[PDB]
Ligand binder design. Sequence first.
Ligand SMILES: N[C@@H](Cc1ccccc1)C(=O)O
Length: 404
Amino acid sequence: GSVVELLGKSYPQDDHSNLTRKVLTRVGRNLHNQQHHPLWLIKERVKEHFYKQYVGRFGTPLFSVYDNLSPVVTTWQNFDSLLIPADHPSRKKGDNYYLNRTHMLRAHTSAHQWDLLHAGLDAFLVVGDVYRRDQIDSQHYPIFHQLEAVLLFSKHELFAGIKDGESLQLFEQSSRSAHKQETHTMEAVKLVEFDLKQTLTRLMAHLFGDELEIRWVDCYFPFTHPSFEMEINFHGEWLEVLGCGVMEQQLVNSAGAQDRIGWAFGLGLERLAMILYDIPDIRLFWCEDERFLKQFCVSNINQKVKFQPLSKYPAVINDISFWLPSENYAENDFYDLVRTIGGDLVEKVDLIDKFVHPKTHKTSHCYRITYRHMERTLSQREVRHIHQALQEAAVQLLGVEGRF
Ligand SMILES: N[C@@H](Cc1ccccc1)C(=O)O
């Protein structure tokens, strides 16, 4: 219709609006605040590291923790506050859940960094549900959870370890390099980067034990420089679990935190939980199967959980092919439709073939859908009927022409 009502507020619909009822109905579910949920367990262990295991020169900073911020944010909060350019590909309608042109469900917990800095906070964690439009497989879900951490330092704290530290400065006017921002001194950046990497290495040792294999990968974000991803070697592959870096000075200065340099990080809770607990499919976080959920009810949050694998059920594979409409088709629109109709019956969707017809000039797409339930065997009848409903919905709602 013309308006969406969410959390007591009204959003007029426009050309950017792309929310689905299934996604909207999970706003407020807050799995990260559900006692004994694995995502809540990871949040509680990370909070304990900051409460008891982080120490600086001036003692432990008191990190305040915000786990109940509304996910409805403006484009300015999600993008402009973090220096994301207007033409950046992360803003595309295909990849984000937009209530309208002005409001969206946050795609990251970094959407709250400016506001919390603007409130005068120098040490904080944000934990919350985040929303992205993407592909369907065992590692991707429309809703996932992140833990954000921000720590700011004055020159007095950063240089407290040396007698003439008061003569050193956070800022200078030089040039941006791979190692630093144009207005940062190398003296400050090396100390901030070291504290960021040391804190994260220690936290991973406090979540996983002492035999973990991690590596730092240099990368880019518009809101940090220098920036890194931490990867964990798991099942023979290097997997990214977080993004981090030295906060861009324009962001810190814009929020009113003058004379501070900071580090920031964003952890993917499902990515970490899937490695820490050997959870094979991200749909298990949303299931109500006691075989999965009972395993995370522990008396001490430091108990090493040894998750017991669930039985794996057979799959039913079906292909769906259709001619795309002349304009405006996006693969994410089809993936959203599969999530709406197929739901948690669908393990993955792969685009396996595309071609252009010589006479009509139309593009054909062929998608392979793997139906596999996490809790039971699927009947051939339920998959056949659901697959047919998906074909009808694609023609009616996406304007495709069936090749069926
Ligand atoms: N917001 C980034 C992670 C990040 C957070 C903080 C600093 C740098 C990177 C993401 O979602 O990938």
